[PDB]
Amino acid sequence: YLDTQLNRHRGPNFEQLPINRPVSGVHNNHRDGQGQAWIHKNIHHYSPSYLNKGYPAQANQTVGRGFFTTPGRTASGVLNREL
Amino acid sequence: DARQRLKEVEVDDNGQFMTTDFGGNIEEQFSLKAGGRGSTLLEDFIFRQKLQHFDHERIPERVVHARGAGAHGIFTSYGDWSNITAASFLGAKDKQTPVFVRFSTVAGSRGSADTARDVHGFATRFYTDEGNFDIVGNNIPVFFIQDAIRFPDLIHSVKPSPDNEVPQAATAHDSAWDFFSSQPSALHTLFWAMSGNGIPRSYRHMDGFGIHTFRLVTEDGKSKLVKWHWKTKQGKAALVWEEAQVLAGKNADFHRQDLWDAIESGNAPSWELAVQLIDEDKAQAYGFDLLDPTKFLPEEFAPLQVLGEMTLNRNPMNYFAETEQISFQPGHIVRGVDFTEDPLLQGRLYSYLDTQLNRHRGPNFEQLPINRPVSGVHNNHRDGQGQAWIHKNIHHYSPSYLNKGYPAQANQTVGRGFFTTPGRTASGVLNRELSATFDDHYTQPRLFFNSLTPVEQQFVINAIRFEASHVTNEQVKKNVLEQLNKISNDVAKRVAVALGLEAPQPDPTYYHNNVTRGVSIFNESLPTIATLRVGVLSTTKGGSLDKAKALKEQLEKDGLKVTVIAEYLASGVDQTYSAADATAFDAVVVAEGAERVFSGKGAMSPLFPAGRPSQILTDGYRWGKPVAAVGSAKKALQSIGVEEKEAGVYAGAQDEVIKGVEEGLKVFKFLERFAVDGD
Amino acid sequence: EVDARQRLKEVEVDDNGQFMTTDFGGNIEEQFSLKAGGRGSTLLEDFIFRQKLQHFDHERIPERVVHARGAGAHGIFTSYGDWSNITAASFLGAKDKQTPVFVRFSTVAGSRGSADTARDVHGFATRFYTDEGNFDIVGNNIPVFFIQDAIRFPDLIHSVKPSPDNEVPQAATAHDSAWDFFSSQPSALHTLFWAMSGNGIPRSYRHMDGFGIHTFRLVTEDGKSKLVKWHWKTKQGKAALVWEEAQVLAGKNADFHRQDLWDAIESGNAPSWELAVQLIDEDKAQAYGFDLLDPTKFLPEEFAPLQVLGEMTLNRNPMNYFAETEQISFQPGHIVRGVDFTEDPLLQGRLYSYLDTQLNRHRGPNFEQLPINRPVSGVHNNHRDGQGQAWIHKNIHHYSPSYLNKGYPAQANQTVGRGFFTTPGRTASGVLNRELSATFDDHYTQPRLFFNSLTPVEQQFVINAIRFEASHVTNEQVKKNVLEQLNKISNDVAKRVAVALGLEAPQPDPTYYHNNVTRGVSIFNESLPTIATLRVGVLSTTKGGSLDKAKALKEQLEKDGLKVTVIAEYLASGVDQTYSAADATAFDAVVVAEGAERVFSGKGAMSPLFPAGRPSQILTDGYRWGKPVAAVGSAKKALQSIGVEEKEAGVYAGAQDEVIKGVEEGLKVFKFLERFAVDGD
Amino acid sequence: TDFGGNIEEQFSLKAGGRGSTLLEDFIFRQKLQHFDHERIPERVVHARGAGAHGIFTSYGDWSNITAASFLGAKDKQTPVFVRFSTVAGSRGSADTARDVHGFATRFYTDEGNFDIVGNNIPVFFIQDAIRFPDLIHSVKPSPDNEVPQAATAHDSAWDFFSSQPSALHTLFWAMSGNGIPRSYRHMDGFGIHTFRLVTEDGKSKLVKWHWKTKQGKAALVWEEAQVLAGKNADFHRQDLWDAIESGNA
Amino acid sequence: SATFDDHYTQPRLFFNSLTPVEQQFVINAIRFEASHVTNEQVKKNVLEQLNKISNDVAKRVAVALGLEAPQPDPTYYHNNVTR
């Protein structure tokens, strides 16, 4: 689903389109790309960084209400091409 | 063989193990997982390379004529036409030039119905030894608009509404009818689209037209005005709207299959290439400007002269690579042919080259096997997305000492190069206006209508009545009727009745009783059959199958493919009753002893939907198709109220049914079965 | 004996003896626009103009997101023997097996038009056109990468590349953002030390060692695996420039390495590389004092000797840079039966990235159908359609499983149809997490092992590079943060850099301090095994019959394998380059011909042909850059005008017997490190 | 992420401690997909260049000579944006290379966007636009090896000038100080073509656009220019940036 | 148009309108650039074209190239100066 969008939209900024854009707000070091609709204010587009005071900051389970995978989830066994 | 040049790019995978796009044998049926019931790994290159290809399979459809189908062919010249044109594919006797034709609709999208009511496309590629030559035409000799700048306006109006994208492949909506009532130039093509030309039987039973006036330049530079025509050897045949609507649902690939089947069965379709020669000085002599795409030239003023014949003998191997990827351009011109100052043609030359960049994502679309010429390409073009070639020439500029002057310039005197007509001059002020000679939009629509049979003319009015009844705006309906009244007061009053509005005011300005030849569809008789689609309604009980097989054998003898319909797929059964429909066939014949299944207990079978056999017979008759009954099968016709002998309807023994049903097809559609106004 | 480009023949287009045509055929005249009169406007009906200009307007494709600046060559890989015991690979499957190759060398931060001699990590990417699929070893000239997790790649690239506000600087790491990242991501410190050394500014693509970086696996037919490290050892030997030379060369000839390769192949002296490997047992993955899944650490030669498998030589130059070099799309995911991936977090994310990026650069999925990308093995899969489909597929049942296609294309695996298989022993154990192993925590030991393994003068070049680069940081806190990180590697390194910055560096941290030394990391220790393809500049003059004496020196030198260019005021009988066109950066050896001392002093130096004091500058530059300088007979006065001793190490004076054999000796040394000032004097 | 929601983009999702990366790591993919597709094609010509925003002020009401809106008023302030550039040079080429320089100016008028896409030399090499690919293909790097970058010192370029004598005027300009200027600010701009200035009534007058620098014309020397291309390839790019920031616009 | 046929008058007007040292810079650029041409016939073709503008310009460039081709063609020769 992420891959196909590059064909249909011919670039990576398909999420900047009004119908796709979230209401939550976007803050990441993604720059450039076909049809960039935004002028980013932070010139230090990387992490870790002293210059950007640590912004955008990393969020996880305990900090900044970030996404996390289920802690109990484990991987066990041989790597295989079977069902 | 025409496909010979494609043999080098043809891939066989039989007897071969599955590989990645970059080589190496693989197993693409299981994802790489972290354990038995584990998550898929990013390190599974096999999955990604397989799915990435799939995710990016689709290219944009054509902005217009998205729905269509093609076939490969061979064009043969009837003689040396060097006296009329410097063209290479024409200046020799029995010269065989490979071709590829793509027929299509207009407003319809990629998945739209073949049997939708629209203008049909007729794009033809000539793989000449002097370059690719395209005659990007339509099945109607006239176009809606006079200036190419108005093309987005016409397309935006006819295509689905921008808010909901309703309707698909139809002109029965407010926007489309507002444009016709606001742009009176659109009225001629409308009358053609509202006729049989709008709903033809097949791509093979179509006449093609280049529309524009072109020029035919001789070696010396002398030009002659020309009009391209494609006359079908199969003859013009059209469906009825009531049939066409059911067919769009029952089989949306009706025309697509019709062509495919013809080539495979051996009966390849043919077309004669005719021209209308006109002197440069007689460009406005015929009562209209020849630079006008809304007007056509009658056969009475200029007879058609046959130049050769084009036959389609090969079907494609991959629809995408061949049919979908083919990129036609009316700008694909060769030495011997030249453009005219036709404002519609002028803007097309730009548009078709431009669009190619969207559809193909780059400039090397001409390097694609289906697009590439047989003549050879030697220019200074380099780079671009998906460069397929490795240019040996490092001095890719002109003029140059380093490349000894190669590639060399060719023109009229040297290297058989293309040249514009020497006589062609530019005179007057630069302006954004249209000639006063383009101001007549009502004479030509009436000439066509006056040249149709009484029942055909009804079909025109019965299409307008249908389409206009969909307009929600009261003022648009009145605006349409005001425009129709300017063509014919009879046409206007008949449409008005269906709309509930009364606006009859005869405007005798463009009224005339002149008639032109070769515009009618049903008037002429069908030449060969070769059509064909004959349905035999039989049954599994009472030994009717054995009697149906005998009829199937005798009827196919005259070069046909007859389909026997029964409850289930027995010994001689091709289609079942649930799978079959009257739209699929041109002739409906009920086999002897076919029950009791038409109105009795046999009609209620779990195999087919309630009252199906009766419906196939009912539909056929009401659609003007020749209907038949062998022996006992007379009760089938009586169950709905169909008399023994009238029009196409013939009863009797086995051989008595075969002879007569064949004569019915020559007529094709029985116009006497359709109600005309005034009765 | 055979042409490595034989497969691209099918697609070559000759236009010699042919008239100009359009892309759709038909002879044309593309030199005049169609106009409405004599002095009239151009007409839209001019299809010739539009079809010519449309192609031109759509010539450019996007450059590579990284490694944009570079040049390639075709070649032939020959196996030294049957390695079936170590790997199931086909190209390593037999003795003297010839496999076609194509190598592309590049930088990283530099854009399409950037200079070849800039201070960056160099790329070294090899395509193996195996009779079992395309196999890519997308490596660099440094054995270690900056980051440990592929997710951090955008962060590293965004930091090293030009600033987003003004797009300054081009092909350089001397800026706040780049140095903030190194001071904030201590994993980046090893590759930095390598980039700051001679490895960052090499002499040529041919005088480079290449490394696959990641640890890989070599699977046998039976399924037994062995951990492996790819290495490309140059038969030409490692040679690097000096920063002061490198800066002038970026301006004088930005296609320095591009020409160096092109010239070598055309002249006959084709470059060679031996393919070496480091074999390691699966059980000894953490046994060497570090995790082998770590791309920030390399394996010393003392623990695992290199084993040669074959040799790769580049014998053919491309015919069209675009179609071949620009359009080539490498992928480390281009794997074949016999080779397998490791759980290296940097490698893992690369497999995704490289396939993805091609959709931007090529604008579709059929990039593998392009002549340069297509394998020689043959393609049989149910992939259909897609932008620019170049093939007509014959099988109408494009799916699996299927009764209709008789089961073709058939599935291949380990036991059937010689298909690819993952290592059977490979297991997944533990919790799914977004963390990095504790075995990856050491970022200071390995940088110090490299530094301790360089010659005293080489160590200064590392110091000076950092001194140069850090002096560009405008932020005072970033400079302190850098010095704090450098102090964790070596207190000596930190104090020497601190001096140039004006700020002192506290306080000795003996945690990762050691005096261990590793072999094969120095560029300047070992002498060049060959002197061929080495440029020598002869400074001569049009007056006093010096040209005739210079031609004699040129003859004896050219027959040894060297490429000799005679410099004079104008293009006379034996003059190749003029004094205004020539520069010391272009040559490895600078020799002043007898009687050329006349253009060093007096009016001879003031000529309208060349800029004021040019001959003197070429000689001055060559000596200060450590290049072996020479003077024949009276030409001793030329060296004296700047203050150069005739008996110094690297300097040669005497006759046309002594100079010829004396100079070619100094070329083996390449660069005389004794001319460079070391701290402590 | 690009579709909202707080995340941690510093660690890949793995199957265990020292395990392989999972396809289910949407964070990694959405971050790398953006990066993988950051680059767009460079301009076919004038790939190397730099711009700045500005304000255009009219000295008076020129309604008598032109119907233009940005001109037919006294002290009328029209927003502008200028992009100066070289020609043969690619995206990463040196600012101090010897070439024709570009001077593209956008006028954000209240009656539409008006562009004067000029050059620092009043004359162009060729007379017919159809010959543009020939000129560019000749001046740009050789198609076999792609040597040289941002230079006209090669066989192909000099074959074209000797074969197309129209190219001789612009050559003399390119061979002069106009070919190696000190800065983008010390450049004169020219619209090259003759244009027409139409009044409300329809009366036209032939016109030639000119941009005269208030800073004055200043150029380097080739021997300096060669060293600068290596020492600082962003010489002109920084020169402009510094001027605006320092206040001296 | 035939009015486009003059390609030598305007180049000389520019050159005649430059200072003595500036004119040298023009010739010192051509001398540099032309010395890179590997083809002997291209160098002669260039000098033939330069001779059509000014015989002085042609003879000065010729010196650096090692070729001698001075034949004054007074057709488009003039001493006009522009500001």
Ligand code: HEM
């Ligand atoms: C007499 C008038 C016209 C005729 C007969 C005509 C006919 C056709 C046909 C038959 C096709 C599809 C060709 C194929 O099978 O691939 C087509 C496509 C198209 N037409 Fe027209 N057309 C006409 C006027 C116009 C005009 C006036 C324009 C715009 C100026 C236009 C723009 C296009 C475009 C953009 C396509 C898509 C072509 C492609 O993607 O390859 N057409 N036309």
Ligand code: HEM
């Ligand atoms: C050991 C670490 C790495 C090495 C040795 C390496 C080396 C290279 C080289 C040599 C090239 C250019 C290949 C060519 O000549 O065409 C390249 C391109 C590239 N690399 Fe890396 N790379 C490394 C890590 C990464 C990582 C971690 C990523 C992102 C996950 C990445 C993404 C790319 C991309 C997107 C390109 C452009 C490729 C193309 O357009 O074809 N690389 N890399």
Ligand code: HEM
């Ligand atoms: C007087 C003659 C010319 C001048 C002054 C001129 C000037 C320029 C300049 C200054 C640019 C870059 C604008 C920018 O900063 O973005 C440019 C771009 C370009 N020019 Fe020219 N040009 C000339 C002639 C031509 C001709 C004759 C053609 C082809 C018919 C052409 C095609 C282009 C193209 C395709 C680009 C790339 C533009 C883009 O990607 O936006 N130019 N030109």
